[PDB]
Amino acid sequence: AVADKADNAFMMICTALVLFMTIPGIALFYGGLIRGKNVLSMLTQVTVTFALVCILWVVYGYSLAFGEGNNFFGNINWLMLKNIELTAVMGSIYQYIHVAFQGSFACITVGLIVGALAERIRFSAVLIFVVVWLTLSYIPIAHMVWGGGLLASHGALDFAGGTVVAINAAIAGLVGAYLIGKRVFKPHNLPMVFTGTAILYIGWFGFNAGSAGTANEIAALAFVNTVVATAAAILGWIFGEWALRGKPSLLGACSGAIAGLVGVTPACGYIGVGGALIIGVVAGLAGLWGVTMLKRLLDDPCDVFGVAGVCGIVGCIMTGIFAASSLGGVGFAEGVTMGHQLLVQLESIAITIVWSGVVAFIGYKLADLTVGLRVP
Amino acid sequence: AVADKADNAFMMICTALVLFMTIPGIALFYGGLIRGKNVLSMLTQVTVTFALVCILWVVYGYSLAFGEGNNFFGNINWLMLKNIELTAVMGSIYQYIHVAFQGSFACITVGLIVGALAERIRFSAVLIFVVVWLTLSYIPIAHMVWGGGLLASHGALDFAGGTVVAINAAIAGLVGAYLIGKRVFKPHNLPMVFTGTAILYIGWFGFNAGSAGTANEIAALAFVNTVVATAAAILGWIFGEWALRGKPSLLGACSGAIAGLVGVTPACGYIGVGGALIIGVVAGLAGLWGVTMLKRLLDDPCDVFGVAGVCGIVGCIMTGIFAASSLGGVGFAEGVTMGHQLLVQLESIAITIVWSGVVAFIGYKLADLTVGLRVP
Amino acid sequence: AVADKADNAFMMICTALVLFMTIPGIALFYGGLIRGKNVLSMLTQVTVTFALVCILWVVYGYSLAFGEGNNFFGNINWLMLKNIELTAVMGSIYQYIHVAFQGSFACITVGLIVGALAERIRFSAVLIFVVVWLTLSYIPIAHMVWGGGLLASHGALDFAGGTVVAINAAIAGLVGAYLIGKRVFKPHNLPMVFTGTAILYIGWFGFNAGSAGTANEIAALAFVNTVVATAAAILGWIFGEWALRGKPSLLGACSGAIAGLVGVTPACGYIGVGGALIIGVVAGLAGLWGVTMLKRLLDDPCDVFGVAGVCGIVGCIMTGIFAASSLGGVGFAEGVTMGHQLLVQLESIAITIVWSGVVAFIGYKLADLTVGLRVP
């Protein structure tokens, strides 16, 4: 196992791009959606929780998510990266790069949750929640899907995190929105929301293409599919908005982008451009329907949770369809029918929703018993 | 033909950087120049038209611009990238990367036009215009210059798009400004203009260096020439402003940057650093003269069209001079004198101006007959 | 000596990331800290001085910093890059890339100084100062540390510029703050400060990892150490702020990030992740103590000078400790004890402080005698 410098280069750059999605991507996205008086506090919480995730990741997160253990968790053999030789290779890159790249995914996942809920949660309480949820939800789900655990062992397809990132975060956020969250504000800085959306989009190329772990033809496919699905989802959302509301809106265009990005996340390295266009259109329409329905059951920006949750599910299911060779995809594994793959996709979604929800509930409850959840 | 992973990596990153120039680069640049009340609508139009370009590109744009056809257009053999094997190599990179990279150029070209004119055009009308102009102007000009068409076949030199992007867009924009456009506002958010300028600048390294198609000594030369010409143009513009207006201005410094970037665009991979410094100085001064004169013939931000048009012409002509070995350039092709090259540069500029102007006129007119051009 | 395309790619991308730290990173950071009425002028000064540095660098800076000369300066053999063949290789990359990469460091160094002091200095005076200081301070210090000069020849360890960039700039800035600078304002746009901090952070991966000059295991180590030290410093600063002020603040979180980034700068490619965590914690606490004390001796944003200066010193000293094999570092050179290395680190810090301070004083004084320092 020797490291390829081209892959090393690509993966370090892709990691910087993923970090860019949180700092400042998601912070700016949310910053434009919440009340002016809450912006500073939310930015502080996203920055501090981001730092917290970075540290827990190196201390034990990477080891428990990616070390060899059982179907649910890794081990404690790589605490503070101990025993990982500097020149150790994982795939075609130095393991240290794999550590950073994987950690950047944990960061954006947590940023998605914190940015929306910062407004309603006590500072000490969000720190407690992050610790419980990163450890008991993000880590096991990452291990099960990308760390050789349960889901991977059953052949689940999730190229860049439709389950691990999107659904995982949407459920944790929706549990929080239900527990706390002001019950009934029109966005104050839409240019700021656009800037955040734009940064998320550009960073998402490192997120999606980088998930190939090498600058090969799959990274290239994922790159093209990201461009295509995002564009198709912007158009799908905007068309539905023109149709149902009479005109498009900036927030609709940005939400459409996120809908396509999320929808193509699990599918990007497995489908054809035709499948990416179809998924993007469906994701944008389902996202619009989603936020419309979520708002009919909801004073905090849950736009992202509705989009990430609904589009993540749609994307994860559609991956079980468009990965088929006959539809331009890379093909299912040997001896796997579309019917069987679809069943595995659904089981993976079900497990992610329940696991994340239960852990989130425990996290919010532990914080509430310890320091009190709701901001004083 | 085998793909080099280092080039694959470089080209995917350069593509993300070019996309960054539109989303959010150009949108922020224009967002700070137009009236506050028009910002949201302009951002929506840039985002939707960007999505539209992405989709038309994969559906048929790439095939018609880059497939083998005649001197003016390619073919319809690569519709939705059909027949392009995932592992197909173009140059030293996977063809899928070439598709994305080339598409990112079409995106910024359209963003340059839409951002300025969004204020004055009906939503449905800008969509119609983009469809007509991307198809009948961007595609043929890209084919003629970079797709083995007319201009390339005559040995025209245009490393990164002085004609295809800059002049092509400036003319389309100036035709629009003449047809519609409020006849006589001082920029409302100059920090926003600076941020957009900065993003355009950083993204321009992918635009210019990436045009080598490989991380070789030419990508390196283009990189250095981009740094040098941009700096020289900021200084040239600012000196002229200090001389004619008594002091420099933030808008002058940002316009100077764009002047150098545009001026070095066709020349970057063919000239020496000395030639880059000279082109940057001349471009910054010609840009200042340009906007001064355009404003004397002009209530919409035409700063970019004047700069892109004037600097694009200057850059394209000067490429026919500074490419000479005797002046530190890479050298003209075998049997080509500076006199002959200059003639080819001029013919390429003439053809681009007329072709883009006529098509633009047809696009605006078709929209006007269909849905009405001017915003209701 | 043959160029490796993977390293070429990595280094050109890392250069774009370093340029991103100045344009617009540092400009936005400062833009949010100063009075609204001074923002435009400061942005103009940072942009023009950035251009000035780019030009002086290619004209003679690179040659005098990196050409072979004596212990203090290089030579004038590479004026305008003359005699540097396009295909010349330096390390494992084309020399042209080395030129651009090194120049980007000179740019951020100057941006750190100009952004803070622009408010209080005449336009013509900042240009004069930059010319004197870049030439007589930045160039010799770069030559002494990275150009085979005095410090390098004594085995000084400074991976990415704790001395050349951080301390060098902090001292020049503190001399300026003492000479000019309004004697006694609460930051007007903290979201802008955060955005600048975020851009500095992301760009810092090119700054730190790129300092390996190749996409190898050291670039990977530096990357991971950058993530770790920044996170640890955000937490260290925030904890001290919670402890001494009762709550964290957005400005404290951003300052903590910069404290970790600066602290790990000289150490990143030589220490273990454990050492990065320790340095980050210490840097964040020392930064907080630093600004607290500097403010007790100080109406201009000197936050950066206090942080860069104090954290740069801390980082440079700690590199002499954590580089030890026994502490997880890459190891000191053959025959060098920790005691000896610490002595060399201190001597390097002392020389940088005095050299930069004296030159800065001369620069400010020459400007004052020529055009008058204080803004009219």
Swiss-Prot record, chains A, B, C:
Keywords from the named record: Ammonia transport, Cell inner membrane, Cell membrane, Membrane, Signal, Transmembrane, Transmembrane helix, Transport
Q: Which PROSITE patterns match?
A: AMMONIUM_TRANSP
Enumerate the subcellular locations listed in this protein's record, separating them with semicolons: Cell inner membrane
Any single GO molecular-function term of the entry would be: ammonium channel activity
Topology in the lipid bilayer is annotated as: Multi-pass membrane protein
Its activity is regulated as follows: In the presence of high extracellular ammonium concentrations, transport activity is inhibited by interaction with the regulatory protein GlnK. Ammonium transport through AmtB is required for GlnK sequestration. Formation of the GlnK-AmtB complex is influenced by intracellular pools of the effector molecules ATP, ADP, Mg(2+) and 2-oxoglutarate. The rapid drop in the 2-oxoglutarate pool upon ammonium influx and a simultaneous, but transient, change in the ATP/ADP ratio promotes AmtB-GlnK complex formation.
- Give the InterPro entries listed for this entry: Ammonium/urea_transptr (IPR029020), Ammonium_transpt (IPR001905), Ammonium_transpt_CS (IPR018047), NH4_transpt_AmtB-like_dom (IPR024041)
Name the job this protein performs: Involved in the uptake of ammonium/ammonia (NH(4)(+)/NH(3)). Transport is electrogenic. Following sequestration of NH(4)(+) at the periplasmic face, NH(4)(+) is deprotonated and neutral NH(3) is transported into the cytoplasm. Neutral NH(3) and charged H(+) are carried separately across the membrane on a unique two-lane pathway, before recombining to NH(4)(+) inside the cell. In vitro can also transport the larger analogs methylamine and methylammonium. Also acts as a sensor of the extracellular ammonium concentration.
- The name on file for this protein is Ammonium transporter AmtB
Its ancestry begins with: Bacteria, Pseudomonadati, Pseudomonadota, Gammaproteobacteria, Enterobacterales
